[PDB]
Amino acid sequence: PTHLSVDTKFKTEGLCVDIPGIPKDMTYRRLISMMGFKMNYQVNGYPNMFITREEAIRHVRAWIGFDVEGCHGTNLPLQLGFSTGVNLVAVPTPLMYKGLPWNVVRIKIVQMLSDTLKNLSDRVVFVLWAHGFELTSMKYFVKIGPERTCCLCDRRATCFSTASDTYACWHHSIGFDYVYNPFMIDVQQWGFTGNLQSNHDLYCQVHGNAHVASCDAIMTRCLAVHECFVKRVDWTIEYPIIGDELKINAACRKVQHMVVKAALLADKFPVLHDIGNPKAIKCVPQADVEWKFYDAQPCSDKAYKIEELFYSYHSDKFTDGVCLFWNCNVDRYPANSIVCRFDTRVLSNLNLPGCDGGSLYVNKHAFHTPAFDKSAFVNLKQLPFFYYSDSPCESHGIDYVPLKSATCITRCNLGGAVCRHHANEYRLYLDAYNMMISAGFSLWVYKQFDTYNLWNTFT
Ligand SMILES: O=C(CN1CCCC1)Nc1ccc(F)cc1
Ligand SMILES: [Zn+2]
Ligand SMILES: [Zn+2]
Ligand SMILES: [Zn+2]
């Protein structure tokens, strides 16, 4: 069972206010036909417009909440709302656009989806809380058929143009008017009691109902994200490379080793309490310190309470030595800590909007992260950039401009002049550090941390 069978039953109860008299007995096969689409017994890669929850989770980067609200259905104008925040008004003659005929509305839809998704996914998945009008309005902007490739490249086709009779992906669809072979999923098929707002508001106070189609579109995708990534966590699902994933992950490992190695050298803690990933390895394997591990999986709902991670009866005394929370999201870090905390507000192709202020960070695996909270860091300070190295000054083996920097903590800089080797390594480390900060990661440290204490490791 790779795809959702068209002969699967579709509960039509959510649809009978917009569509009175709808048959209770309904399949996807009959529903698609009623939506004005003909699938012609086609075995060409598009078995069903609707997909399973599992296929939706694999394609989370494609999710776009979609809601249609009748302003007045043949004679009435429709308000089309998308989880991008956009509201279009289609006439059959927070961004609010005035009423316009479908032929121009469909051009705006292709532009919006292509700009939102070209750097995220090879498709669109319309996330619905279906009541009727969203499904009946799809014939006005969607064309279906066999799976196709782009006219300008090797990617799959997501748009079609009636002006040129051609197909295009999200990158080459300027001037295209039809969404081609989109996917969709109705959240209302998952067995919920009550309406959209009552189920959304049980888990999220960040999205409100300003009573427009885009507000519902946002709540719909938010509730779908809560169900599939907050209260259900699957870290087995792999996701494609769409940006700087490999460099960001490599930078993270270099910054962790650098920052922990320097903290151990500058303050000589007898013990390190490593709280986080149960699969973690010693990031500074040559350090003299007693390394003690504590398992805690990445929290996807609310941040861990420090009182529950530490208390209720390990050295038992976490106040001895230093605590390392590398992506272990707690409500208030202890004063003796080294912390790496993902900033959920960061704008990037890897970070998708999430539930209750949190975000869905997708890098190889999907990780819903609780909202960034500045108050979690009151006992700590921001960790300044610095590069430390006790490696011998020796070139071995990229042209050179002399490096002058107060943050290159090396024997050569102490002795007056930075050597070529440490200058190349400094600039490579600064690049890795900047990559990690820009990816949304933030670094925090105990208030006594001072890089001045690293110069005396050169005696
Ligand atoms: O079933 C009907 C027609 N209704 C019920 C009987 C007479 C009026 N339409 C329809 C159903 C689902 C859908 F997605 C689009 C259209
Ligand atoms: Zn293309
Ligand atoms: Zn929400
Ligand atoms: Zn040097």
Angstrom CA distances, 87 to 206, 214, 289, stand at 19, 6, 58
Closest C-alpha among 336, 341, 320, 339 to residue 448? 336
Q: Which residues pair with 78 in a beta bridge?
A: 70, 90
Q: What is the resolution of this structure in A?
A: 2.0
Residue 25: inside a domain: yes
Residue 4: inside a domain: no
Residues 62 and 158 in one domain: yes
Distance CA(38)–CA(53), nearest Å, equals: 24
Residue 430: inside a domain: yes
DSSP H/E element including 267: helix 245-267
Residues 164 and 63 in one domain: yes
Please report the DSSP string for 374-386 in residue order: GGGGTTEEEPPP-
Residue 408: inside a domain: yes
Closest C-alpha among 348, 346, 364, 355 to residue 442? 346
Task: Say how many Å lie between the CA of residue 386 and the centre of ligand 4.
Answer: 15
Please report the DSSP string for 73-123 in residue order: --SS-EEEEETTSEEEEEE---EE---EEHHHHHHHHHHHHHHHHTTT-SS
Distance CA(410)–CA(14), nearest Å, equals: 67
Residues 257 and 381 in one domain: yes
**Tokens for 445?**
């440290």
Check 18, 59, 67, 421 and give the catalytic one.
67
Residues 161 and 177 sit within 8 Å (Cβ to Cβ)? yes
Distance CA(255)–CA(212), nearest Å, equals: 45
Check 165, 211, 316, 399 and give the catalytic one.
211
| Radius of gyration, CA atoms only, the chain | 27
Residues 271 and 298 in one domain: yes
Residues 422 and 333 in one domain: yes
Residues 396 and 340 in one domain: yes
Task: Say how many Å lie between the CA of residue 62 and the centre of ligand 1.
Answer: 28
DSSP H/E element including 295: strand 290-295
Residues 226 and 271 in one domain: no
Residue 67 among the catalytic residues: yes
Residues 249 and 325 in one domain: yes
Residue 343: inside a domain: yes
Residue 324: inside a domain: yes
- E-state strands within 309-348: 322-326, 337-342
Residue type, 142: V
Q: What are phi and psi for residue 101, nearest 5 degrees?
A: -65, 150
Residues 269 and 318 sit within 8 Å (Cβ to Cβ)? no
Residues 204 and 267 in one domain: no
Q: Could you give the number of structural domains in the chain? A: 2
What is the extent of the structural domain holding 278? Answer: 245-457
Task: Say how many Å lie between the CA of residue 19 and the centre of ligand 1.
Answer: 6
Closest C-alpha among 14, 15, 50 to residue 192? 14
The atom number, within ligand 1, closest to the CA of 135 reads 14
Domain boundary among 200, 230, 260: 230
Residues 367 and 408 in one domain: yes
Residues 195 and 344 in one domain: no
3-class DSSP state for residue 134? helix
Please report the DSSP string for 157-179 in residue order: P-EEETTTTEEE-TTS-TT--EE
Per the annotation, binding residues for Zn(2+) are 150, 153, 169, 172, 200, 204, 207, 222, 393, 412, 419, 422
Closest C-alpha among 237, 210, 443 to residue 340? 443
Residue 1: inside a domain: no
Check 18, 59, 131, 134 and give the catalytic one.
134
3-class DSSP state for residue 274? strand
Residues 298 and 156 in one domain: no
